Design a protein around this ligand. Structure first.
Ligand SMILES: [Ca+2]
Lengths: 297, 298
């Protein structure tokens, strides 16, 4: 597997819940980048060097993803709730001396990110979320069209071992299909093939796939519950935040993203990028530039 | 290898313009067509058909593309697996037997064929029984987190091919057994005859049979929904006397009664809960049989 972060260090950050793997590069204020599904930290390989000019970039595999340890799940999928993941990543950052940092997340990592921002806002200077709405918003807008478009939210949330058994027949197909279907182009062309190899290899592990289901099960249950409490209490993110979404991505299909985030964040700016779901790989120049400007403010 | 679960029933291959319908046929009296759903075959009626055969000519048909029925070639709109097309084919199948006015009971997908038939060609039906469904439109209109999680397979199997086909091929035996177990009241296969499960397992083992089921659900998400929507908006109601049976632990139930929802679709509908999960004729065969004979006798 290729090193897509030449000159970046590599850290195994030990936490109470297992090791976080991270590539580390650049200098300046600490910036944590979190990938999503079905990816690993290497999805940032096109924009992390450009951020590394101005920030200490920490490119972490999510708890349970990539090369991070997989905490053993439980009946409530607790370690793979965004709340628990946020906690583990806060722990990881503290091991590096980062108790106050900037954070950008995409997909699942963006959900960890806004949940981190709601649970422990004092940990964040600024927050960027890439192509998501809050988990609560997806479920609340889950009508016919949206249930078809993001079917995997209900399918991967099905009780073990049903998704795992189906995914295990041909893991390569599913990871490649999920990658392809949410690009603007509808194929794998936006991706560096060495990055695809990373995604494909991570997905080839049955326990890694279980973890991803656990993450989606948390997303259907505890994640939704945590979010529901916040939205019904009027708890807003107080960290300055950037919401970037793809014009052909997931967030914009059932809502106007900036309108939704103004319900969740007291201080949010947003910008569409011409892109599918995978903003940092489909549109790396426009994404890196959006993140450099926001975090330099 | 595959047990004969309808002793005394014969076996018909009914020709239609879109391929053969397989049916087990028994009894005498007014014609009664029994339609199975997903992921079963006609054999799901094996505990209730003998009871109905005391008073009806019972035709126990494999849905087009299911079981041993032929699989008509699908197209971009999944047209032969829309409930409208399936109903036209079964109307044609019944005509081959001289049945132009018949009683109809369907479960699951076959229940969807059945109420669509009732809507499109009500004159063909003496009475209609639907087991453990609401109309397709109602499921989709009620699509929320809870339902999306409970009937996930409606959006999963409706994904463009070959995605659900490929994943179903990952472990087809587990999938059909999981689908059967998870919708029973017990949560295992204990309510099913092991010989019937073999039929379901063997039908589900053919990739082309699984593809058709996916076509059925693709139609369930698109054309079937649009056909239902037109009837909603035009105020068209099923005029034939209708029985709506649902499992107390089935898919149709939730918070609002299936009966109140069927009253928006049917002029003349009675309804009863059966202590059962989704698979009323196998989980509650006596309670289902008696409700059906009671209703179809009138
Ligand atoms: Ca298996």
């Amino acid at each position: 597997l290729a090193d897509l972060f030449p000159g970046f260090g590599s850290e195994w950050i030990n936490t109470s819940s297992g090791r976080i793997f991270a590539r580390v590069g650049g200098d300046g204020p600490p910036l944590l980048l979190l990938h999503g599904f079905p990816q690993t930290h290497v999805m940032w390989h096109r924009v992390a060097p450009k951020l590394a000019e101005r920030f200490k970039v920490i490119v972490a595999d999510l708890p349970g993803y990539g090369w991070s340890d997989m905490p053993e799940s439980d009946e409530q999928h607790t370690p793979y709730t965004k709340r628990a993941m946020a906690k583990q990543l806060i722990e990881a950052m503290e091991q590096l001396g980062h108790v106050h940092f900037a954070l950008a997340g995409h997909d699942r990592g963006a959900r960890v990110s806004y949940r981190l921002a709601l649970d422990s806002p004092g940990r964040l200077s600024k927050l960027a979320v890439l192509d998501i709405l809050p988990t609560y918003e997806y479920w609340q807008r889950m009508n016919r069209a949206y249930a078809l478009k993001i079917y995997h939210w209900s399918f991967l949330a099905q009780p073990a071992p049903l998704p795992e058994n189906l995914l295990g027949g041909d893991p390569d197909f599913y990871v490649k299909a999920k990658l392809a279907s949410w690009t603007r182009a509808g194929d794998l062309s936006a991706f560096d093939p060495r990055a695809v190899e990373h995604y494909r290899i991570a997905f080839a592990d049955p326990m890694r796939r279980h973890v991803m289901c656990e993450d989606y099960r948390a997303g259907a249950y505890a994640d939704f519950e945590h979010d529901k409490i916040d939205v019904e209490a009027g708890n807003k993110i107080p960290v300055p935040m950037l919401a970037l979404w793809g014009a052909s991505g997931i967030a914009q299909s059932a809502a106007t993203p900036l309108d939704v985030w103004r319900k969740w964040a007291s201080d949010v700016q947003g910008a569409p990028i011409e892109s599918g779901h995978f903003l940092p790989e489909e549109a790396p120049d426009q994404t890196a530039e959006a993140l450099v400007r926001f975090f330099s403010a």
